[PDB]
C-alpha cells in the first residue's frame, strides 16, 4: 500500500529511499530512468499554478469548473506516496492549515486531500454548500474505497473529486436529485466492471474555517448492492430532505 510522509518538510532520508525503492521495484524497466532522473544535472522548473479568486460577475457552475481545472492542472498523484498526512478525526482548523500550506507548496494530490482542497477553496461562498461522499466497492477479489465532494448550489447537485480514471471524479451541477447523482456514479463504476457494495454520505460542512468541528462521514450508510434501487432512492431522497432542512443532528 502507498505510504505517507510524516516528517513535515523536507522529506527525510528514510521515506526518500523507501519511495525510490518502491518506484524502482514497480517500474518494469526500473533503474534506467530512475538513475537518469536522480543524476540529472538540470531539469525544467515546474510553473506555479495560481490560486483562482472568486469574482461576482462570473457564474457558480463556472466556478466549480474552474476549481476542477486547477485541480486537474495540479497533476494528480500516482507516485504511490502521500505527501501530506491527514487525520479524519482531526478538528477542522488543522485541516485548513494543511490545505493552505498544501496550496503554498502545490505538490501532487490524491482523492482525500483533493476533497479537502475543494472544501478549502469553496469555504468562501455561503451560497455554495458542500459535503462528502464515500464508496466501498469490490473488484477482482479485493475491496477498494473512494471519496468525493458533492455540492448543492442553486438547488442542483454536482460533484468534484479526483481519481486515476477520468469520469469518476467530476460532474456538473445538472442533477435534480441526489439519487440520480449516486446512480450515475454507480453506472460509471459498473463501466469499469467494479461492483459497489456500500455507500456512505456525511453532512454539510460548516462555513466557519477556524472551528474545531470534525468532519462526519458515516451519518448515513447503506449496502447498495444487496437492496433494489427503488428503496435506495426512497431512503436517499428522505435523507436529502432531512439534510437540506438541517434537521439531522
Amino acid at each position: 500500500l502507498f505510504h505517507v510522509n510524516k516528517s513535515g518538510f523536507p522529506i527525510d532520508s528514510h521515506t526518500w529511499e523507501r519511495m525510490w525503492m518502491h518506484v524502482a521495484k514497480v517500474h518494469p524497466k526500473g533503474g534506467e530512468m530512475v538513475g537518469a532522473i536522480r543524476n540529472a544535472a538540470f531539469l525544467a522548473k515546474p510553473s506555479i499554478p495560481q490560486v483562482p479568486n472568486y469574482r461576482l460577475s462570473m457564474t457558480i457552475p463556472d466556478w466549480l469548473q474552474a476549481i476542477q481545472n486547477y485541480m486537474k492542472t495540479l497533476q494528480y498523484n500516482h507516485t504511490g506516496t502521500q505527501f501530506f498526512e491527514i487525520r479524519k478525526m482531526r478538528p477542522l482548523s488543522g485541516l485548513m492549515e494543511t490545505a493552505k500550506e498544501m496550496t503554498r507548496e502545490s505538490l501532487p494530490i490524491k482523492a482525500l486531500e483533493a476533497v479537502i482542497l475543494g472544501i478549502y477553496l469553496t469555504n468562501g461562498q455561503p451560497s455554495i454548500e458542500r459535503f462528502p461522499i464515500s464508496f466501498k466497492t469490490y473488484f477482482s477479489g479485493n475491496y477498494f474505497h473512494h471519496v468525493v465532494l458533492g455540492i448543492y448550489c442553486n438547488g442542483r447537485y454536482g460533484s468534484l473529486g479526483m481519481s486515476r480514471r477520468a469520469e469518476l471524479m467530476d460532474k456538473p451541477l445538472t442533477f435534480r436529485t441526489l439519487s440520480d447523482l449516486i446512480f450515475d456514479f454507480e453506472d460509471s463504476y459498473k463501466k469499469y466492471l467494479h461492483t459497489v457494495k456500500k455507500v456512505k454520505i456525511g453532512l454539510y460542512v460548516p462555513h466557519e474555517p477556524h472551528s474545531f468541528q470534525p468532519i462526519e462521514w458515516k451519518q448515513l450508510v447503506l449496502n447498495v448492492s444487496k437492496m433494489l434501487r427503488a428503496d435506495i432512492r426512497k431512503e436517499l431522497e428522505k435523507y436529502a430532505r432531512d439534510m437540506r432542512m438541517k434537521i439531522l443532528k
Binding site: 430532505r241 432542512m245 438541517k246 434537521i247
Partner: protein, 428 residues
Amino acid sequence: MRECISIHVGQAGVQIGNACWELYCLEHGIQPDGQMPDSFNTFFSETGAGKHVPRAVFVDLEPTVIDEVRTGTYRQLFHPEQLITGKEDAANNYARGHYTIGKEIIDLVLDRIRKLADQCTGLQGFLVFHSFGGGTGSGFTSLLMERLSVDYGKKSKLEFSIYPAPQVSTAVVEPYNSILTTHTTLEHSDCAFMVDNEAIYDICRRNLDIERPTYTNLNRLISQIVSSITASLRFDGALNVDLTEFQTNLVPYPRIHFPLATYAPVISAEKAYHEQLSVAEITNACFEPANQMVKCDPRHGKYMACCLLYRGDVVPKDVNAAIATIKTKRSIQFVDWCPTGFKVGINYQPPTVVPGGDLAKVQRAVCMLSNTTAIAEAWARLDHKFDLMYAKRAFVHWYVGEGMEEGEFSEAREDMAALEKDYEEVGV
C-alpha cells in the same frame, strides 16, 4: 423498576396533562405540594425528606399555558426546569414547529429526557400527548419522536392524540397538519390512540346529562382512560397486563396499531342509584356504538383484536360469562382469522373520583380497547377535506415560505391512501 416518562406537547397536551397529574396525585395520595401525608415509583421519584417529583416533561413553544401551570395550584410539584417554553408559538403551521422554531429548543428538552431516563433503573416506555390539528403538536412532536427513536431504539412509545372531528372544528388548516403528522405517528409510534371532541361531547350530553360541557370534562375522561391503561404497572391483580404484553394481542401486523379506547360505566351521580351496574351490563355497554370516543360506526366494521382491562370488584367467572354472551351476538362481527380476540386483565383497585368532577362513585370499571377496522372511515372523511383544499393550493404559501417543500403534501396523501388500503386489505 417499572417506570414510564410522559411528555406533553402543545396546548392540548399540557391541558390534558393537568388532569392526568391531578388524577395520579389523587390516586397515590400525594398532596399538591408533593409531600405524602411503593406503587408511586412508576410515575414519581422520591427526592429525600418525603418529596415526590413527577416524571414529566411539559413542552410548548409559547409561554401562556405553561405559565398558568407555573403560577397555578401545582407550582410546587413539577421540577422548575421540566417546564420548558419558547417565545412564539408554531401558529397552526407545521413548518414553523418542525423546522424553524422547533430547532432552537429541541436540545434543551432532549437533555432533560436523558437526565430523567438516567434516573430510571428499568424504563418501560414513553407516553406522548399531543394534538393533530396544531402546529406545535404536529411539527414538534414529529421532531421529538424522530430524535427519541434514534436515541432510545428499544422503548415503546404510546401516543394519545386528539384527532380532528368530522363537523366541529376550531381551525381552517387542520387537514394539512393532520396529514403531515400521520407520517411520524405511523412510522415511529407503537400504539396511537385517536380521540374526537364531538364524540366525547355527545357522551357527556347523553350519559352525564351535562348540556353545556367544556374541555375540562373531556380531559378528565381521557385522563381516566390513561389511568386505566397503566393500572397494571402500579397496582396488583389477578391478571396483570404490562405494556409489551398489552401491545402483543393487539397488533397483528406491524402497521395495524391504531386502536380506539372506550370506558364504562359513565353516568351522573344521581342516575347510579337506579342502575344495577353488574359486570354483564358494563360489558354490553362497552360494545354499543353510542359509547365510542371516536365519531365512528363500529357496526360497519369487524373487531380484529380486543382487550378488556377490568378493575375493581371483579372475578374471572363473570368476565368469562360476559365474553361468552358477547361472542354469540350477531351485530358484534369478528374476523375469521382471529378465533380468540379477548385479552383480559383484572385489578383490585376501583376507579377514583376527583372532588370537583361530575362522575359517580362506581365499584367496578372496564377499559375496552379495540383494533377494529371501522376507524378507516374516521380517516377517510379527513382525506376528503384535504382533497377540497389542495386542489386550489389554498394556504400553501405559508408552508412553502416557512421552509418546507411542496412534494411533502402529495407524499403524505399517498401514504394515507396506502394506509387505508392496508386496513381494507385485512378483514376480507
